[PDB]
Design an enzyme around this catalytic site. Structure first.
Site, PDB file in Angstrom:
ATOM      1  N   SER A 164       0.806  -1.214   0.000  1.00 46.04           N
ATOM      2  CA  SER A 164       0.000   0.000   0.000  1.00 46.04           C
ATOM      3  C   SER A 164       0.848   1.277   0.000  1.00 46.04           C
ATOM      4  O   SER A 164       0.306   2.387   0.065  1.00 46.04           O
ATOM      5  CB  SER A 164      -0.966  -0.048   1.148  1.00 46.04           C
ATOM      6  OG  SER A 164      -1.934  -1.072   0.903  1.00 46.04           O
ATOM      7  N   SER A 214      -5.039   0.463   2.539  1.00 44.13           N
ATOM      8  CA  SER A 214      -4.838  -0.837   3.155  1.00 44.13           C
ATOM      9  C   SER A 214      -5.776  -1.839   2.492  1.00 44.13           C
ATOM     10  O   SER A 214      -6.994  -1.667   2.557  1.00 44.13           O
ATOM     11  CB  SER A 214      -5.060  -0.810   4.655  1.00 44.13           C
ATOM     12  OG  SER A 214      -4.869  -2.095   5.221  1.00 44.13           O
ATOM     13  N   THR A 219      -4.359  -3.540   9.036  1.00 46.25           N
ATOM     14  CA  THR A 219      -2.935  -3.533   9.348  1.00 46.25           C
ATOM     15  C   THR A 219      -2.688  -2.586  10.534  1.00 46.25           C
ATOM     16  O   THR A 219      -3.165  -1.449  10.538  1.00 46.25           O
ATOM     17  CB  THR A 219      -2.106  -3.176   8.108  1.00 46.25           C
ATOM     18  OG1 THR A 219      -2.416  -4.125   7.089  1.00 46.25           O
ATOM     19  CG2 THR A 219      -0.620  -3.185   8.381  1.00 46.25           C
ATOM     20  N   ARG A 277       1.461  -6.581  -3.367  1.00 43.09           N
ATOM     21  CA  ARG A 277       2.672  -6.321  -4.135  1.00 43.09           C
ATOM     22  C   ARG A 277       2.408  -6.253  -5.640  1.00 43.09           C
ATOM     23  O   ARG A 277       3.339  -6.022  -6.420  1.00 43.09           O
ATOM     24  CB  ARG A 277       3.741  -7.369  -3.789  1.00 43.09           C
ATOM     25  CG  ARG A 277       3.404  -8.815  -4.114  1.00 43.09           C
ATOM     26  CD  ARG A 277       4.287  -9.734  -3.303  1.00 43.09           C
ATOM     27  NE  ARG A 277       3.877 -11.135  -3.377  1.00 43.09           N
ATOM     28  CZ  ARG A 277       3.208 -11.780  -2.427  1.00 43.09           C
ATOM     29  NH1 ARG A 277       2.890 -11.181  -1.284  1.00 43.09           N
ATOM     30  NH2 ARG A 277       2.817 -13.019  -2.647  1.00 43.09           N
ATOM     31  N   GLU A 362       8.731 -11.256  -1.506  1.00 44.33           N
ATOM     32  CA  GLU A 362       7.526 -11.672  -0.802  1.00 44.33           C
ATOM     33  C   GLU A 362       6.763 -12.740  -1.593  1.00 44.33           C
ATOM     34  O   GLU A 362       6.052 -13.548  -0.992  1.00 44.33           O
ATOM     35  CB  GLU A 362       6.595 -10.499  -0.524  1.00 44.33           C
ATOM     36  CG  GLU A 362       5.682 -10.760   0.651  1.00 44.33           C
ATOM     37  CD  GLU A 362       4.812  -9.583   1.051  1.00 44.33           C
ATOM     38  OE1 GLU A 362       4.115  -8.996   0.188  1.00 44.33           O
ATOM     39  OE2 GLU A 362       4.910  -9.224   2.202  1.00 44.33           O
TER      40      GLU A 362
HETATM   41  O1  LIG Z   1      -2.373  -3.374   2.328  1.00 44.32           O
HETATM   42  P1  LIG Z   1      -2.395  -3.930   3.770  1.00 44.32           P
HETATM   43  O2  LIG Z   1      -3.511  -4.979   4.015  1.00 44.32           O
HETATM   44  O3  LIG Z   1      -2.352  -2.826   4.872  1.00 44.32           O
HETATM   45  O4  LIG Z   1      -1.058  -4.825   3.954  1.00 44.32           O
HETATM   46  C1  LIG Z   1       0.233  -4.196   3.828  1.00 44.32           C
HETATM   47  C2  LIG Z   1       1.273  -5.213   3.410  1.00 44.32           C
HETATM   48  O5  LIG Z   1       1.482  -6.193   4.461  1.00 44.32           O
HETATM   49  C3  LIG Z   1       1.451  -7.512   3.901  1.00 44.32           C
HETATM   50  O6  LIG Z   1       0.162  -8.076   4.051  1.00 44.32           O
HETATM   51  C4  LIG Z   1       2.392  -8.388   4.699  1.00 44.32           C
HETATM   52  O7  LIG Z   1       3.741  -8.048   4.331  1.00 44.32           O
HETATM   53  C5  LIG Z   1       1.850  -7.273   2.411  1.00 44.32           C
HETATM   54  O8  LIG Z   1       1.701  -8.296   1.434  1.00 44.32           O
HETATM   55  C6  LIG Z   1       0.975  -6.047   2.148  1.00 44.32           C
HETATM   56  O9  LIG Z   1       1.295  -5.350   0.960  1.00 44.32           O
END
Ligand SMILES: O=P(O)(O)OC[C@H]1O[C@](O)(CO)[C@@H](O)[C@@H]1O
Ligand SMILES: O=P(O)(O)OC[C@H]1O[C@](O)(CO)[C@@H](O)[C@@H]1O
Ligand SMILES: [Cl-]
Ligand SMILES: [Cl-]
Lengths: 550, 550
Positions: A164, A214, A219, A277, A362
């Site tokens: 993100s 996100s 997150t 990603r 990743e």
């Molecule tokens: O976009 P989100 O759900 O906040 O996650 C952030 C990042 O953390 C992960 O889920 C774990 O590294 C990644 O694949 C992802 O891009």
């Protein structure tokens, strides 16, 4: 289900092990040019983008010949690279461990081909969100979307981490020549409070727009950072009803977005089958659309789309991202090189290696195959890089004279967005691009060191082994379309690698343990009582922190 | 002359090969904690800085025990690490291939100990330049040094590359909390004209100061960039006599400085025995002194000085940078790990890994020993990293679940310069620091995956091997003094490594071939005639560029 368990089981893998011993390990690139006067022509490919712009991919300084590449192609066929690719494009649930489609290709379906998940075309739903992104970014950019006191937006802050964040950062940096003066983008990503404090320091809440990015919208770092920005906004704005003019969300999770106090009209949605990603193509790229305008962002998508069509429709042996993936496996699994260096001869692309690091590592840092057995061979490479010519003055000494094989990709645009001094800087930059790959290949033997003036024990210190491989990627210009094609190239290279290794390039189970363990410890940091609930190192580190913390 | 030819010849090297087979290769960190209730205490060290601040270095999650470390110490003794160290501190010409002293330690001799090169104390001459740096930076900062129209300086642009750039960038970023609002620093480094155009875009020539930073003052990119800045300045200022208020030089080469049109009174000098990648302590750090003030810069030097005294006076077995170097060799040469990950849990330290990359890789990426024979073993590691928690969401998936051993150093400050929300972000950040090393060590077996709910073929996908090594470095706070001690730690770690490998950590012959080859090609790019003077790849790339260039 997979057709095979382990890559090491494929008959051509065993053949390549023999080819490695007899021809690969002592391969002489110098000898290869001397044997084959058509080597450059045979080992280089022109990609033609949708806008008739071009990118030359020159693999000819690699440790490969026709024999070796033919074998790698046969390996790709045994591993079912084509069947997996076609399943991906068909919308099938090839992310087996999460039982999901893998459909970043559908985000840049600007031709509106039929691209179904669960037997239902996604073309229109993807297009609808892009239409929303166009309207909203146009509003910001023309000044008709006003903040809570009736002023146009001057600054956009993306809040988000990993998938993100790295995309928005890398692409806004890379395409910065297409931005508008007075309309700036910023990024908060780290939970480290330094990141919030430094980014918001000089911004005006009345003219600042936040994009909370996100996939999950759960997150820990991102929600905390978004709460802190909402606190900062409300310290000035006072009333929660003003949030609706200053906070948008880029997410799959409408429930959590709305629970956060963001209006559903200000959500830019995407689906589960977009990996983080591989998400810059989605709503996640909204910061890009605002920074350089939607049409440029659409051009970036159409560059990806054209490279996707190349990947889908080209026989393996001429399939540019496949060739890149095959060389990677060659170096990773037969030579035992652990790294893959990516060096843009381009300052705008300074965060291009950091972006690729997530895409590659990743995806491919896995130990378990699609047949659900543990690998007995190397999977993902460690990808690193810095822009040149900076990198030449940092670690290129080791690339030229160290004891490690480091497969390297060099990238240059023939035309600069900044051709100052009638291109004096550009020609110098280009000269370095050509010379570095030349140098790594040709080396410099004992005899030449002696001819150039060294005597005695100084002689070996000035020798270059040479025979050090590079891939050179020459674009006409790093336009949006070019950058979209270049990212898609690494996406499908990553694809090929994972397919050969029989891994799932599309999950990330490896991040969960750190997350669960951090929450446990976070609760323990709510007081200054010594802890003894972990191993002695973890306990000792925590207890020392408690003694030293504020 | 060296006492030995190859590291592989040292009797303890041969012993360690056996120890690797019998105890190292299958070393269980979990078993080590269970065997030894004092493991944390035995494998962690508190460094006490000159200001009584502290840094905990915890090596206990590494694949090492007393047997192994004792052997590595015996190896260090056989390799004459102490004799080489003491020669360095004595001012001896241990940079054998260039017949130079290696005397970055003398740049931060704020105690004014006797530190002679060629039998002549350097203490006062180093001190004199620092006095000049104090006067000049105070002038800039208080507004008494005025530009050509009588205005105070608002912006300082460092122009320089590699050793003349990465240090100023990394340290001004790292210590940015100590800067003054309205007094900004900028960097031009790449020859890519984008770098000049983007940096000078919004600056005012009347209030902009340039620092031309080049050890040699002949680097092609730097002189070209400095010429371009001088052009930009004179497009507004018109008269060359105004240059004297806007251009200073940080260099060893007064001749070339003066030939460039910079006044000798505006030169901040250093000597040949300062390697570029160890130069931030010199005149090169002038941008740092201006950004955060000379006294903070002096504190940074005194942190280095205290770590130097630690390195010089501590028996190997308790000598913190030595222990770090010994583990590196252990991983590089016995396990065959090719990389070394450095992860600051600190946003300010975002460019700390990029800085270390030059220090480490340009020093130790060598194939020839001090006895002037080729190595038959691995030398320099490939060093990479990004700040956490960002890195957790990029490539940590591979660190946890990939097939590669990646020795990792994690760095955290117990106190933030930005303790927003009564330290909510800081405690979260810290929780991640503790949990990531915990996670990498403890892993998660089949049984736990089953207990947590997975069935069938999903089970292996969610397993963590654990037993993955980390070094944790906990500081009280990233002050100037702390940062100086941390850099010196990596400098002496780099030292130990190079000493064991019997390489010259202090030359860089590996950059010359690319430089010579680029000049040849640069002349060829002055027209659009096809070239056939190189290998067919280099020719084809050049000719395609000529077709596609402006
Ligand atoms: O976009 P989100 O759900 O906040 O996650 C952030 C990042 O953390 C992960 O889920 C774990 O590294 C990644 O694949 C992802 O891009
Ligand atoms: O400070 P200078 O002489 O411009 O050199 C820049 C850099 O280039 C090198 O000489 C070659 O990489 C480095 O060691 C140095 O730091
Ligand atoms: Cl090699
Ligand atoms: Cl491992």
């Amino acid at each position: 289900m997979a057709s095979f368990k382990l890559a090491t089981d494929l008959p051509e893998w065993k053949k390549l092990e023999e080819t490695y011993k007899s021809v690969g390990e002592k391969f002489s690139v110098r000898d290869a040019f001397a044997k084959d006067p058509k080597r450059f022509e045979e080992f280089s490919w022109i990609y033609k983008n949708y806008d008739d712009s071009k990118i030359l991919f020159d693999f000819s300084k690699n440790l490969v010949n026709k024999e070796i590449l033919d074998q790698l192609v046969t390996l790709a066929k045994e591993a079912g690279v084509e069947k997996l690719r076609d399943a991906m494009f068909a919308g099938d649930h090839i992310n087996t461990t999460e039982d999901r489609a893998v459909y970043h290709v559908a985000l840049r379906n600007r031709a509106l081909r039929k691209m179904p998940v669960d037997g239902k075309d996604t073309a229109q739903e993807v297009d609808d969100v892009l239409k929303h992104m166009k309207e909203f970014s146009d509003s910001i950019r023309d000044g008709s979307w006003t903040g809570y006191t009736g002023k146009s937006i001057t600054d956009v802050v993306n809040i988000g981490i990993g998938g993100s964040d790295l995309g928005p950062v890398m692409v806004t940096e890379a395409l910065k020549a297409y931005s508008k003066p007075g309309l700036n983008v910023h990024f908060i990503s780290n939970i480290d409070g330094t990141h919030t404090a430094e980014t918001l320091k000089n911004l005006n809440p009345e003219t600042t727009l936040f994009l909370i990015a996100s996939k999950t919208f759960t997150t820990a770092e991102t929600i905390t950072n978004a709460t802190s920005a909402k606190n900062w906004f409300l310290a000035t704005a006072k009333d929660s009803k003003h949030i609706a003019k200053h906070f948008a969300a880029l997410s799959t999770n409408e429930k959590e977005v709305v629970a956060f106090g963001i209006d559903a009209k200000n959500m830019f949605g995407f689906e589960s089958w977009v990996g983080g990603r591989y998400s810059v193509w989605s709503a996640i790229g909204l910061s890009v659309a605002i920074y350089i305008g939607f049409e440029n962002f659409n051009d970036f998508l159409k560059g990806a789309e054209a490279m996707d069509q190349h990947f889908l429709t080209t026989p393996l042996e001429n399939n540019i991202p496949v060739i890149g993936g095959l060389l990677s496996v060659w170096y990773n699994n037969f030579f035992g090189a652990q790294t893959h260096l990516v060096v843009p001869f381009d300052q705008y692309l300074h965060r291009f290696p950091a972006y690729l690091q997530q895409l590659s590592m990743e995806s491919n840092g896995k130990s378990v195959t699609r047949a659900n057995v543990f690998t007995n061979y190397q999977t993902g490479t460690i990808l690193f890089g810095e822009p040149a010519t900076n990198a030449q003055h940092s670690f290129f000494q080791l690339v030229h004279q160290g004891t490690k094989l480091i497969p390297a990709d060099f990238i240059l645009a023939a035309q600069s967005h900044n051709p100052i001094e009638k291109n004096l800087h550009q020609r110098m930059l280009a000269s370095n691009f050509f010379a570095q790959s030349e140098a790594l290949m040709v080396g410099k033997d004992e005899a030449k060191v002696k001819a150039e003036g060294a005597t005695g024990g100084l002689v070996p210190h000035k020798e270059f082994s040479g025979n050090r491989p590079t891939t050179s990627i020459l674009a006409q210009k790093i336009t949006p379309a070019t950058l979209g094609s270049l990212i898609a190239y690494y996406e499908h290279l990553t694809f090929t690698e994972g397919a050969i290794w029989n891994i799932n390039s599309f999950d990330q189970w490896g991040v969960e343990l750190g997350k669960v363990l951090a929450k446990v410890i976070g609760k323990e940091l709510d007081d200054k009582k010594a802890v003894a609930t972990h191993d002695a190192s973890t306990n000792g580190l925590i207890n020392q922190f408690k003694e030293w913390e504020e």
